[PDB]
């Protein structure tokens, strides 16, 4: 997990289902499409 990236902007929208970050709108509108599954027991977290 190095830091080989650089570029500021704005993240008004962020997916919580998977934890993916997005800056555009249309990008999220379609991101939800693939998200057909429902919240199920698996990712054990605190
Ligand atoms: Zn997602």
From Swiss-Prot:
Overexpressed in ovarian cancer tissues compared to normal ovarian tissues. Isoform 1 and isoform 2 are expressed in squamous epithelium tissues. Isoform 2 is overexpressed in squamous cervical cancer (at protein level). Expressed in blood cells. Isoform 1 is expressed in pancreas, lung, skeletal muscle, heart, placenta, liver, kidney and brain. Isoform 2 expressed in chronic lymphocytic leukemia (CLL) and several tumor cell lines. Isoform 3 is expressed in several tumor cells. Isoform 5 is expressed in fetal liver and several tumor cells. Induction: Down-regulated during erythroid differentiation by GATA1. Down-regulated by HTLV-1 Tax through the CREB/ATF pathway. Up-regulated by the regulator of nonsense transcript UPF1. Up-regulated by the cyclic AMP-dependent transcription factor ATF4. It is found in: Cytoplasm. This is Zinc finger protein 268. Belongs to the krueppel C2H2-type zinc-finger protein family. Interacts (via the KRAB domain) with TRIM28 (via the RBCC domain); the interaction increases ZNF268 nuclear localization activity. Isoform 2 interacts with CHUK and IKBKB; the interaction is further increased in a TNF-alpha-dependent manner. Forms a ternary complex with TBK1 and SETD4; the interaction between SETD4 and TBK1 is ZNF268-dependent and leads to TBK1 monomethylation. A zinc finger (C2H2-type) spans 13-35. Involved in the regulation of antiviral interferon signaling. During viral infection, recruits SETD4 to TBK1, leading to TBK1 monomethylation, which is critical for the assembly of TBK1 complex and IRF3 signaling. It comes from Homo sapiens (Human). The KRAB domain functions to reinforce the nuclear localization of isoform 1 in addition to its transcription repression activity. Coiled coil: none annotated.
């Amino acid at each position: 997990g190095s830091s080989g990236s650089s570029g500021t902007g704005e993240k008004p929208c962020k997916c919580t289902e998977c934890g993916k970050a997005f800056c555009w709108k249309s990008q999220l509108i379609m991101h939800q499409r693939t998200h057909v599954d429902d919240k199920h027991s698996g990712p054990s977290s605190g």
